[PDB]
Amino acid sequence: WKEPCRIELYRVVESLAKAQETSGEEISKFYLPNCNKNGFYHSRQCETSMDGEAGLCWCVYPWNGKRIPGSPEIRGDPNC
Ligand SMILES: [Fe+2]
């Protein structure tokens, strides 16, 4: 797609909404694609947190949102 992150974000949000309907426990962290305004992926991708815990972050190729091999994953800005 020309805006792969934007498209994925919409789909993930829809899927999350559906999952929450039947979810056996309230999920307070989840991954929403972190998109730039052009519809691609920010180099940094972070888990969304709603529980006062830092989300995991990792680094991705902006054109596909796939984790860069050998790049770090930490609960903080990995400095991608
Ligand atoms: Fe970026």
UniProtKB/Swiss-Prot annotation:
Q: Phosphoserine occurs at which residues? A: S23, S28, S71
Q: Does the keyword Phosphoprotein apply?
A: yes
Q: Which residues carry this modification: Phosphothreonine?
A: T22
Instruction: Provide one Gene Ontology cellular component.
Output: extracellular region
Q: Where in the cell is it found?
A: Secreted
- Taxonomically, the superkingdom here is Eukaryota
Could you tell me which cysteines form disulfide bridges?
Answer: C5-C35, C46-C57, C59-C80
- Tell me, how does this one assemble? Binds equally well IGF1 and IGF2. Interacts with integrin ITGA5:ITGB1. Interacts with VHL; this interaction inhibits HIF1A degradation.
Q: Report what the protein is called.
A: Insulin-like growth factor-binding protein 1
- Organism encoding this protein: Homo sapiens
Give the shown range, full length included.
Answer: 172 to 251 of 259
